[PDB]
Amino acid sequence: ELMDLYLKMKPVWRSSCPAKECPESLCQYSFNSQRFAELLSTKFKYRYEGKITNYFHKTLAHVPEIIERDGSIGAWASEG
């Protein structure tokens, strides 16, 4: 289930135009983030209690606001 949650999350910030490529995954990103966070808190308490990593925090917190402000996330990457 953690694996499925990550695969449901990834298109949102990897799409070059999420509003026209993955609206169904976009509209439930908040619910997926909540579910992922509660899973990490409960089932994986042995690693994520009082210590979490930068990229997990970023993915679970800041993505929708960045999408709203910019329009796309993957377009402005450093992969180019």
């Binding site: 993915t59 917190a61 180019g80």
Partner: protein, 320 residues
Amino acid sequence: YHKMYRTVKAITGRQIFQPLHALRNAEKVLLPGYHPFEWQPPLKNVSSRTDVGIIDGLSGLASSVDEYPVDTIAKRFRYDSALVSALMDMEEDILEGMRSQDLDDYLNGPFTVVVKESCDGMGDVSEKHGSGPAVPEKAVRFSFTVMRITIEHGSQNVKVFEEPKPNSELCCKPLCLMLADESDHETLTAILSPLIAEREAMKSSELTLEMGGIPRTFKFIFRGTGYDEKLVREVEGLEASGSVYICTLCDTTRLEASQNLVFHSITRSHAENLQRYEVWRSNPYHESVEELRDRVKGVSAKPFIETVPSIDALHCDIGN
């Protein structure tokens, strides 16, 4: 290419491929320093000459025995001239885009151009022998792309050109290549200060360019989204890469970030970080080191490159 041209000459008899000198003559048109551009108002601290090509990236840094030692090689382009060349390389593209949405062809409305500047260092670049300073075996590149260009028509706006492959290697146009270290800060600031000065000067200026028989004006909006987290921290004040304060977008500490993990907001900016550095340096509230750090929320440096608070998808995927 010379070998291929010579053998095709010898066999076929005609001249199918053009000579190298002809190629080099046609080369100069695309390179910066060939088109005329006028600013209004003129850029502050930027010369009005329109034939600047490849200039030294050190910007005439003092390299005598009496001052700070320099161990870098840097060749860079003036930002405005590079933008002019990038815009002129897509003259036909802009004309086609303006034709596509049933607009005019001689319309000279103020274009709004957004540019994504990306800077990332490299490792294991082999230093060469030969005359020069004790150059470290690290290379830092600075580059920019033209994402979208819009014109103001009527009450709303309409897009003319949008890059279909924003992450391709064909759009990351280089700007400034220095063979210096990313960790070293003094040399990085010394070499990258002129580009930041030019960008700040152009933030509030109008570029005039003769676009296919009709003069049109330009505007520039810059977003620094193409930096990795380590360089973002090393530039915009934040210390190290792993500390008590984690995100470069929110003032949330590690423990409560782990505890909450779902509810956060974006607060950090560049002017705010400048104010926080001023607070740290002046110590207005007469506090100890720990309480001053808590008040300043991890800003212990002077930011000097404006980085837009975004997330880097590639390195995010790598870390996850």
